[PDB]
Amino acid sequence: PVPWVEKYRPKCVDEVAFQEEVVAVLKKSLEGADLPNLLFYGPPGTGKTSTILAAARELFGPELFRLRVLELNASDERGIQVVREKVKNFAQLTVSGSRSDGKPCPPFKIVILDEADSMTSAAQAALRRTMEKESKTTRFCLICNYVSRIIEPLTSRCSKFRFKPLSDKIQQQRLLDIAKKENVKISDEGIAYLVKVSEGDLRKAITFLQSATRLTGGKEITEKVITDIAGVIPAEKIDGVFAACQSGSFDKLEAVVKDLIDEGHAATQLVNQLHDVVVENNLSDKQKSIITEKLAEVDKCLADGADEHLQLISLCATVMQQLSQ
Amino acid sequence: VDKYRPCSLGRLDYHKEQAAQLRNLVQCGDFPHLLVYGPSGAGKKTRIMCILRELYGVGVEKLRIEHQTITTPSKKKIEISTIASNYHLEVNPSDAGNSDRVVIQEMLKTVAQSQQLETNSQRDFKVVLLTEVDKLTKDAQHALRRTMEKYMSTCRLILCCNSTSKVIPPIRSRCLAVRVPAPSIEDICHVLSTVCKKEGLNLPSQLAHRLAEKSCRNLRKALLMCEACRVQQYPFTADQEIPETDWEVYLRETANAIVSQQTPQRLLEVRGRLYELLTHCIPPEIIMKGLLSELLHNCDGQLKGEVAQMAAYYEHRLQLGSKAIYHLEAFVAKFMALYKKFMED
Amino acid sequence: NLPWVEKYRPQTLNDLISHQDILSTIQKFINEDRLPHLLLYGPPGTGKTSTILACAKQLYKDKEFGSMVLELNASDDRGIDIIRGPILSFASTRTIFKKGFKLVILDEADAMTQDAQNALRRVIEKFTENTRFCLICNYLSKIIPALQSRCTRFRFGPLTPELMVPRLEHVVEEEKVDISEDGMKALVTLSSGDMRRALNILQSTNMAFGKVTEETVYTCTGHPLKSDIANILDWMLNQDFTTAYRNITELKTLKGLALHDILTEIHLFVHRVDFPSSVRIHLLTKMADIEYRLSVGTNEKIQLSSLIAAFQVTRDLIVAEA
Amino acid sequence: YELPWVEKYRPVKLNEIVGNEDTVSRLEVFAREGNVPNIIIAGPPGTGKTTSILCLARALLGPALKDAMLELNASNDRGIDVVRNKIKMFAQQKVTLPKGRHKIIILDEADSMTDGAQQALRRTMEIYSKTTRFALACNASDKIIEPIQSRCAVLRYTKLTDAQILTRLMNVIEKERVPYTDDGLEAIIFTAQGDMRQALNNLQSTFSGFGFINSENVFKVCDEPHPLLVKEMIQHCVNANIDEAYKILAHLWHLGYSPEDIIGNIFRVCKTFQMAEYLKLEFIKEIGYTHMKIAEGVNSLLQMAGLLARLCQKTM
Amino acid sequence: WVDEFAPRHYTELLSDDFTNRCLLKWLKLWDLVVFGHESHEQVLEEMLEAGLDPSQRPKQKVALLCGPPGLGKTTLAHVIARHAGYSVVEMNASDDRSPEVFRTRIEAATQMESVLGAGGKPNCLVIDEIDGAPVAAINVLLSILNRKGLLMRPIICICNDQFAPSLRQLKQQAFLLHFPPTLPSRLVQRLQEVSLRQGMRADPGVLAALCEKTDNDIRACINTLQFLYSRGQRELSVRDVQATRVGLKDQRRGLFSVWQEVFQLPRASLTSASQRFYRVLHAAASAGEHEKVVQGLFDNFLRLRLRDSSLGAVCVALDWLAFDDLLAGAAHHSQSFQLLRYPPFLPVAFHVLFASSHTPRITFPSSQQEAQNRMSQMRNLIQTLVSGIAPATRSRATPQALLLDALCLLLDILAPKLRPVSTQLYSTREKQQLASLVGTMLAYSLTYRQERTPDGQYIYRLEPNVEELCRFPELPARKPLTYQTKQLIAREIEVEKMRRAEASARVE
Ligand SMILES: Nc1ncnc2c1ncn2[C@@H]1O[C@H](COP(=O)(O)OP(=O)(O)OP(O)(O)=S)[C@@H](O)[C@H]1O
Ligand SMILES: Nc1ncnc2c1ncn2[C@@H]1O[C@H](COP(=O)(O)OP(=O)(O)OP(O)(O)=S)[C@@H](O)[C@H]1O
Ligand SMILES: Nc1ncnc2c1ncn2[C@@H]1O[C@H](COP(=O)(O)OP(=O)(O)OP(O)(O)=S)[C@@H](O)[C@H]1O
Ligand SMILES: Nc1ncnc2c1ncn2[C@@H]1O[C@H](COP(=O)(O)OP(=O)(O)O)[C@@H](O)[C@H]1O
Ligand SMILES: [Mg+2]
Ligand SMILES: [Mg+2]
Ligand SMILES: [Mg+2]
C-alpha cells in the first residue's frame, strides 16, 4: 500500500513550500489557541488538504492524529443523514486536551470536509445548523474547489485561504525530485508532457507517474505510455478529424468516427480535446461559437447517457457544416 | 472462439505493447483498480482473462456458478447468478434494475470483511470483476465509489465496460484506464488465417477481407462468421455468401420499408417491426445505430447530416424515458416527414 | 462570547417586524383562545421559530414551557416511527397544569414524506382540543394538500430593506462598529431579506476586520464583485474568442469564482443591459440551458465556452443590427 | 371550543352528497335493496370516500350502528397482526339484525397494505360474506389486486367539479349567513384547487379572520402567487414579450416565493387560460419540462427566466 | 351468492371429465393405505398405474391445481373429496404466517389417525393459496412429504402461479393439473342441471352467451344468476343477458367512452374548442386509470384514419408521449408528487390532434402488454439458456453479446446440410463433422425435442427454443433440416450424453 499522493504529503508545515504566508498564519492561529474560523480553497493538486493535515500533525501530534481529526468526503456523503450522524458521533466524544508528552494541546477536534462545494444549498444549510449545534467542542475546516460555491453562512464562520496554482517550473522540479527519489527514469520532455496532460494538478501527475512506473516496470518512460495512461487522444486523430470535416463528405466522417470508436477512444476525451483545439485556432467567431455550443450539448448528452457514436457523428456533421461551407 | 482463446499474455496475436504493459503491471506489486474499456468484441475479456492468469497460478480457469440471495430494502430475496472461483469473483450488477447498489455493497462486504482462506497461495487482495458497469445508475456508482474507498486493502476491482461516458469521473479518476481497441482489418485477417490454418482450412485472403469488412471489426462475430461459412460450404471460394445475422438484415429491411413509402400505415407496419425488434431483447441503441447506418446508405443531397443530428437527439430522449418505442417511432416519424419534404421538393 | 442572533433574539410580539398583520391575527386568536394548528412557511431566517416561541412564552410561563411544549427539529429524523412515537404520545395525554392545550413545534416540516404527512394528518385530526400543532417549513408545495387543508397556514415573507435597516441601525448603535452607506447596501443586498444572515455577516465582519464597508463584506463573504462581472461581460461582448476564454479562465482560477455564480450574476446583469428582445430571448434560453448542463455534472470549460459562444453570437447580432 | 367546518357540516344522508351522480344513485339503490356487496371505493383524496360509505352504513344499520359497524383507518397500526385479530374478531360477533342487514367493516386507506394482508383479506371477505360486508376505501384502484376486485364491486369517485363546489359553498354560505362577493367566490375556487375540505377550511379561515368575503381577503390568509400577476405573466409570454414578463417574474421573486410555488401557480393559471389549443399544449409541455428541471434540483431564477424565454419563443 | 346452487355431488362439477377422472383415480388410489382395501394423458395414466411405494402409497402425495384464481378448483376438490368417501377439512395459507402455528394447523391438525366420532367418515386435507405462503411453510410441507410418521392422508394443494420459485423443489414429486375448466359444453350442461335443481328456467343459448360473456367464470355466474333470481325474472332471454352485455370488462366500458371522447368528435354553442377541451380533460381525469388510457391512445392513433399526409401530428403526439414518459420517470425518481398534474393533459392533446367526425374501430391495447410479456418470456428464455451453459464458456461472453452476435450464427453452425444415411456409412470427415456438431450441442446444452402438433404428426424443435430468439418472420424463409436428420442427431446427442456419463463414471 504505497499511495504516492499520500506518501509525499509534507507532514511538517515548514516542509510546505510556496505557501509560507498561509503556513505562518496557520502557525499563528495554532499558537493563539482560539481558532473559530478556517477554510481552504483552490484548484486540485495545490496541497490544501496536505497543508491542513500538516497543521494538524504539528499541533495534535501523531498520538492525537487518530483521535481528534476526522476527514469526510462531501461528494461521497452527499446524503443529509450520514453527515448528521457521523459528525455528531465524533463530536459527542469528550476527549480532554491533556497530552502524555506534556505538550499543551488546546481543546478542540478538527473536521475536514473534502470537496465541500459539491453540496447543494439545503445540504449546506443543514450543515451550518450542525455547525451551530457543535460550535464549542469541535472545530471545522472545509475544503472546496471554488469558494463562491459555498453558501454565505459557512463563509461567516470561516476565514478564507486562497491557493495559487503552482507554476510549471516547480511542478517539473517536484516531479524530477520524486523520480530521483524513487529511481524513475524519465526525461525532461516526459515530465513536461506529464504536466501538460495533467493541467495544473499534482495529484493527477503523481498518480500518472505512479501508473507509468507500474506499466513500464523499470523501463524508460516514453511519450506513448504518458499519452495512453491519461487516455489522451493523439493530435494526429484530431488533425484527421478536422481534415475530414474541412474537405470531405459524410463517408469520410463515418470512416474517422468508426475509426475513433473502434480504437476505443472515449467521447469525453474527444469533446475536451476538440474544444481545446477549436478554442485556440484561427476560425471565425461564429464558427467557433456554433462548434463550442455543439460540443457543450454533446457532453451534456454523454453525461445523460446517450450513445456516443450518434453524438460523435452529429458533432462531426456540425463541424463539417461550419468548416466546409 | 472458446477452444483456442489464448490463455496468457504471451500467446496473444494483436496489441503486443499493451500486453507488455499489462504483464509489467502484474510483474510488480500494488496492482490498482483497473477500468478496461473499448468497443465490443475487441478482446477485453481475453485481456482480463490473461491478466487473471498472470495474477495467479493455473487454477484461474476453474469456474463455478453460484446463485446468491440478496435482500432489497423491501423484504424480497432475489437470486443473482455469479460466476466465481477460488481466486476472483465475476459479477454482473446490471441485472438488478434498482437493487444494484445493495448487491455491490453486500458482495463487497462479504468479499472484503471475510478474509482469504489460504493467504500463501493467493495475494493479500482478491479481484471482483464487475461486468457492464455503464448502465448502472449514478447513485449506484456512488455506492461503488464508497465501497471501493472503504475496502481498498483486500478487494481491488477490475471494471469491464464500454463507452465510458456513462461512467462518472469520480470513479474513473481512481482507476487505471486500460483501453483495448478493436483489431485492424489486417489483424482480423491474420487471426482468421491462423484459426483456419490450425484446423486444416484453405481460406483465401479475399474472403477473409470480406469477413473483416462485413463484421465491422468485431472479432467474435468475424470468427463465428468464419465457422458458419465453413459449415455452410467447406470449399472456400473468393465469392461466398457470408452468413448474415438475422436481426441485421431485418433492420436493413426495416430501413427499406421506411424509405419505401411515407404513409402512416407504413408507420404502423414499421411500428410492428420495431416492436418485434424490441421484444427480441436487443437494445434500442443498437437499433438506432443500425437504422441510421442503413438510412445513410440510402440518402443523398446532404440530408444525411440533418438526419444524423436527428438520430442522436432521439437517442438522448431514449436515455431520459423508459418506454423506448415512443422515442424510436418519433425518430422514424420525423425522418419520414423530412424525406417526404425532401422528395416532394 | 455569544453570537448576536442568540443575544438579540426577539422576545415580544412588537419586537418582530414586517409580520404585523400575521402577529395581529395571532394575538387576536390567542386572546380569544381560538388558536388553530399553525403552519408557518417561508424563506429561512425570516422569523418563524422566534414568533412561535414568543407566542409560547406569552401563553405559558417559564416553569411550564418545558412541560407543555415539545420541540422536534432537524436532529430528529422525520419518517413514520416518529409520528407513531413521541409526538403521538405527547399529543394524546393530559397535563396536571392549567386547563390549556399543548404545543408541538416541528421544525422543518417540509422534509416529511407523503405517508408521514398523512399519518400526521391522522394525529392532528384525532386530537384537536388538547393539542395545537405548529409545523414550520420552507416550501409549502412539499406537503400534501390534506395537511394544508387541516392546519391554518401563514406566509412569513422576506423583510424589505426599507423596514430592515432600522434594526441594523439599532444593532450598530448598540454595538459600536464602523458603519458606512456602502456597507449597509452590501448587507441588505447580500443578506437577501433575512435578518439571520445579516446579523451573522455583520458579526463576522466585526470580528474579522473591525470595520464594515462594502469591500470588507465582499472579501469576508466571497460574493462576486460587480466590477468583476462587468469585466466578464465586457470580455464576452468586445473581445476575441480565445482572448475572452483565456481572460475568463484566468479570472476563474485567480478570484475563486465558479461558473454557477458567474451564470447567476450575469443573469442579473443582462436584464440591466438594454438588449433587443430577440437576442435577450436567445441569451436567456442559452444561459438556462448552461445552468441545467452544469446541474447534471459535466466539464466546466466547455460550458464556459458555450457561455462565451452565446455572447459572441450576441455581439455579432448586436453589431450587425447597428 | 367550536368545531371546524370540515366536520361540522359533513352530510348525514346520501341525498346531500354532490360529488358523484351514478355512484350515489347506486348507493341509494343499495340502501333500500339490502343485498349490499363488498365494495371498493376509488378516487382522489378529499372527494368524500368515507362520508359516503358512512352515510350508507348509518342509513342501513340505523339504531344498531354502534355494535355492527367498524371503521378502521390508517390512523391506528397498519400491521398484519391488527388486521388478523380485530377484523376477524369483529366479524365473528353476532348482532341481531333484519333480513337485508349486514355488519360493515370500512377499511379506509386500503392501498398501503402489503400483498399478504390483501391475500388474507380475500379469505376474510369470502368466508364471512353472509354476516358482514366489506368496504375498502382505496386511493388508487390499480394497487388493489385482481382477485380482490373480482369478487367485489368497484365504485369510482371523481374529483369535485367547480360547479358542485360552487353549489356546496353557496349552501354553506346561505346556512351560515355569510355576506359574499362573486370575486371572493372565484378566489376561494382558485385557492380550493378542486378539494372540498380545502375549500371549506379556507372559507372558515377567512371568515374567522376577516368576515366579509372578497377576493382581497382570501389571499391574505393563503398568500399564493396572485393569479392576476401570473395571468399577466402568461399573457406577456403569449404576446411576444420577455422584458415585461421578467419584470412580473422578478416582482414575484423578490417577494420570496419558491420556484415550485410560482411554477405551480403558472400551470394552474395556464390550465384555465384563453388562447389557441395547440399553443396551450406547447405551453403545458414547456411548463412540465421546466417543472422537471425544478423538481430535479435546479431551482434558480435563471430557470424561470429560461422558461419565460422558451414560452416567448414558442409564439414566434 | 352460491347459496343453494352450490355443487355437492360428482354430477355437479364444471370441469372436463379427464381431469376429474384422473383426480378421482388419484383419490381412490389411497384406499390401499387409508382404508386398507386390496401425449400427456398416457403419461399421467402410466404414472398413476405403474409402480407404487412398498407401503401401498403413490409416488406423488400432493396435487398442484395450478391455474387462474377463479374457475372453481376449490369447489371441485371439495365435491370430489366428498364423493370419494372423505370429509373436507380446509385450511388457508394466507392467514397463517408464523411457522409454529402453521405446523399446528398442519402437523397438529390433520393427516394423523384422526378417528373422529363418525367412524365411517375419514378426513382429507385441502390447502388453498400455496403460492403466497412463505418459503418456510413450503419447506416444512416438503419435510413432511419427505418424512419416512408416514404420511397417509392426501393433500390437495390449490395453486395460482405455477412458476413461483418456492415450488421449484416440490413439483418433481407432485401431480400437476393446469387443466382449463372453461369448456362451455360442460359449463352450460351443469348450469342447466343446477337450474333444474331449483326451478329457474333458462335457455341453453342464453347461458352459453353468459358463459362466453363473463370469461367462463362459474362462481360469478352463480352469483349473477342468484342476483337475477332476486330481481324477480322467472324466465331468461337475450335481453336479460344484455343487462351488462360485456362480462370481460373490469369496468372497461368507461374507457371505451373516453377513447371515443378522444377520437369521436361530439356530433351536433357546444362547438367551441374550449368546451371539448374541458370535457375530454375532465373525462381523462375521471377515467381513473391512466396507463391503460395512454397505451390505448398509443395503439389506437395510427389505426384511426389520419389526414396528416405530411405527418404533422404524429410527431407532435409522439413528442407528447415522450413527455409523459419523462414525467413518469421524473416523478418516480425525485419522489415529488406535484408532477402528476400534467399527464392528464395527454388525452386532450390527442383530442386536438385527431379530432375527426369519423368513428373507426377502437381496440383495447394489446401491443404493450403482450410486448412486455414477450420481453419477460424472452428474458427468462435467455436466463434458462445461460443457466444451461457450462461455466467455462459462460464467463467468456455477456448475454447481450450472445444474443446480438452469436445466436443466429450458432443456429447457422448447428444446421448444416446432410443426407438420410446411417451412422456407420458416414466417412471420416463426416464423422468428425458430426462429432463437432454433438460437441457444440453438448457444450451449449441443447437437445432436439419431439412435439405433437394439434394436426397429429410429430415435429422437432429446439430444447430451449433458441430459434424463438434468433429468427424473424418477415425474412425470406431458409431451408430447415429434415425430420430424419433431426432423429439422427437426437440419437447421436443422447448416445453422446450416455458416453459422457460413462466417462464421468470412469473418471470419478
Ligand atoms: N506547497 C507544497 N509544498 C510541497 N508539496 C506540495 C505543496 N502543495 C502540494 N504539494 C504536493 O501535492 C500533493 C497533492 O496534495 P493534495 O492535498 O492531494 O492536493 P489537493 O489540493 O488536496 O487536491 P485534491 O485533494 O484532489 S481537492 C501533496 O501530496 C504534496 O506532495
Ligand atoms: N422579524 C424579526 N425581527 C428581528 N430579528 C429577527 C426577525 N426575524 C428574524 N430575526 C433574527 O434572525 C434570527 C433567526 O430567526 P428564526 O425565526 O430563529 O429563524 P427561522 O425564521 O425559524 O428560519 P429557520 O429556523 O432558519 S428555517 C433570530 O434569532 C433573530 O436574531
Ligand atoms: N360530495 C361531497 N359532498 C359533501 N361534502 C363532501 C363531499 N366530498 C367531500 N366532502 C367533505 O370533505 C370531507 C370528506 O373527507 P374524507 O371522506 O374523510 O376524505 P376521503 O375522501 O374519504 O379520503 P380518505 O378517506 O382520507 S383515503 C368532509 O369534511 C366532507 O364534508
Ligand atoms: N489473441 C487472440 N487470438 C485469438 N482470438 C482472439 C484473440 N483475442 C481475442 N480473440 C477473440 O475475440 C473475441 C472477443 O471476445 P471478448 O474478449 O468477449 O470481447 P468483449 O470482451 O469486447 O466482448 C473472442 O471470441 C476471442 O476468441
Ligand atoms: Mg481533496
Ligand atoms: Mg428553526
Ligand atoms: Mg376520508
Residue A18: φ, ψ to 5°: 75, -10
CA distance A294 to A300: 10
Kind of pairing between the strands at D132-138 and D39-42: parallel
Nearest residue to C43 via CA among D292, A153, D254, A127: D254
Q: Which residues share a beta bridge with B71?
A: B77
In chain A, where does DSSP find H-type helix? 4-7, 20-32, 48-68, 80-91, 121-133, 152-156, 168-181, 188-197, 202-216, 223-229, 235-246, 250-262, 267-278, 285-304, 308-323
CATH of the domain at D176: 1.10.8.60
CA distance D197 to D194: 9
Residue C147 C-alpha from the chain's centroid: 23
Chain C positions in Cβ-Cβ contact with residue A266 (cut-off 8 Å): none
**Does B6 sit in the ligand 4 pocket, CB within 6 Å?**
yes
| Top mutation candidate among B219, B223, B225 for ligand 4, by most atoms within 8 Å of CB | B219
Q: What angle do CA E95, E101, E103 make, to 5 degrees?
A: 115
Question: What amino acid occupies position C26?
Answer: I
Chain D positions in Cβ-Cβ contact with residue E289 (cut-off 8 Å): 141-142
CA distance C320 to A285: 14
CATH number listed for the domain at residues C224-314: 1.20.272.10
Kind of pairing between the strands at A138-144 and B127-131: unpaired
C-alpha cell at D306: 429560461
| Top mutation candidate among C195, C199, C201, C203 for ligand 2, by most atoms within 8 Å of CB | C195
User: Could you give the domains of chain B?
Assistant: 16-179 (3.40.50.300), 246-344 (1.20.272.10)
Please give the full DSSP string across B152-167, using - where no structure is assigned: TTTB--EEE-S-GGGS
Task: Give residue numbers after which chain B breaks (C–N above 2.5 Å).
Answer: none
Contact C200 A43 (CB under 8 A): no
C-alpha cell at D133: 360486508
CA distance E269 to E275: 9
Contact B50, B36 (CB under 8 A): no
* Same domain, residue pair D7 and D82: yes
Contact D100, C144 (CB under 8 A): no
Q: Which residues share a beta bridge with D135?
A: D39, D106
Nearest residue to A203 via CA among A57, A16, A21, A9: A9
Establish how many alpha carbons lie within 13 A of residue C108's alpha carbon, considering only the half-sphere containing its beta carbon.
14
Q: How many domains does chain D have?
A: 3
CA distance A205 to A193: 10
Contact E438, E492 (CB under 8 A): yes
At which of D160, D179, D200 does a domain end?
Answer: D160
Nearest residue to D287 via CA among E317, B87, E342, A35: E342
Give the three-state DSSP class for A116: helix
Residue C288 contacts A where some CB pair is shorter than 8 Å: no
The bound ligand whose nearest atom lies closest to the alpha carbon of E396 is 4
Q: What angle do CA E214, E219, E224 make, to 5 degrees?
A: 65
Residue with cell 351488462: E244
CA distance B34 to B172: 9
| Top mutation candidate among A13, A166, A203 for ligand 1, by most atoms within 8 Å of CB | A203
Residue A141: φ, ψ to 5°: -145, 115
* Same domain, residue pair D115 and D193: no
* Same domain, residue pair D55 and D116: yes
Q: Which CATH architecture has domain C1-159?
A: 3-Layer(aba) Sandwich (3.40)
Is the sign of the CA dihedral C72, C76, C79, C85 positive or negative? negative
Contact E61, E145 (CB under 8 A): yes
Give the three-state DSSP class for A144: strand
How many other C-beta atoms lie within 10 A of the C-beta of residue C210? 10
Greatest extent of chain C over all pairs of C-alpha atoms, in Å: 82
CA distance C296 to A299: 10
CA distance E61 to E45: 16
From the number of C-beta atoms within 10 Å of its C-beta (0-12, 13-18, 19+), residue C205 rates as buried
At which of D224, D251, D270 does a domain end?
Answer: D224
Contacts of E508 (CB under 8 A, 6+ apart): none
CA distance D298 to D292: 9
* Same domain, residue pair D219 and D240: no
CATH of the domain at D236: 1.20.272.10
Contact D213, D179 (CB under 8 A): yes
B221 Cα–ligand 4 center, Å: 10
Contact D302 C263 (CB under 8 A): yes
Containing structural domain, residue D143:
1-160
Task: Give residue numbers after which chain E breaks (C–N above 2.5 Å).
Answer: 38, 148, 268
Residue D108 C-alpha from the chain's centroid: 14
Contact A257, A277 (CB under 8 A): no
Contact A44, A199 (CB under 8 A): no
Q: Which residues share a beta bridge with C39?
A: C135, C153
Contact A298, A273 (CB under 8 A): no
Instruction: Specify whether domain C160-223 bears CATH 3.10.520.10.
Output: no
What b-and-e string marks burial along A24-63, b requiring 16 or more CB atoms within 10 Å of the CB? eebbebbeeeebebbbbbbbbbbbbbbbbbbbbbbbbeee
Region of C209 please: left (phi>0), alpha (psi -120 to 50) or beta. alpha
Chain B positions in Cβ-Cβ contact with residue A306 (cut-off 8 Å): 312, 315-316, 318-319
* Same domain, residue pair D143 and D16: yes
Give the three-state DSSP class for C70: strand
* Same domain, residue pair D45 and D95: yes
CA distance B247 to B227: 19
From the number of C-beta atoms within 10 Å of its C-beta (0-12, 13-18, 19+), residue E115 rates as exposed
Contact A121, A151 (CB under 8 A): yes
Contact C288 D246 (CB under 8 A): no
Residue D143 contacts C where some CB pair is shorter than 8 Å: no
Method: cryo-EM
Mutate to test the interface with D, among C19, C285, C303 (most CBs of D within 10 A): C285
At which of D224, D242, D271 does a domain end?
Answer: D224
Please give the full DSSP string across E115-170, using - where no structure is assigned: --S-TT--EEEEEE--SSS-HHHHHHHHHHHT------S-EEEEES-TT-GGGTTT
DSSP B93: G
Q: Where are the domains of chain C?
A: 1-159, 160-223, 224-314
CA–CA min distance C258, chain A (Å): 6
CA distance E38 to E33: 9
* Same domain, residue pair D280 and D155: no
C-alpha cell at E385: 439458456
DSSP A247: S
CA distance B106 to B109: 5
Chain C positions in Cβ-Cβ contact with residue E336 (cut-off 8 Å): 142
Give the three-state DSSP class for E452: strand
CATH of the domain at D55: 3.40.50.300
* Same domain, residue pair D238 and D120: no
Resolution as reported, in Å: 3.3
E strand residue ranges, chain B:
34-37, 64-71, 77-84, 88-91, 127-131, 158-160, 176-179
Give the three-state DSSP class for D18: coil
C195 Cα–ligand 6 center, Å: 13
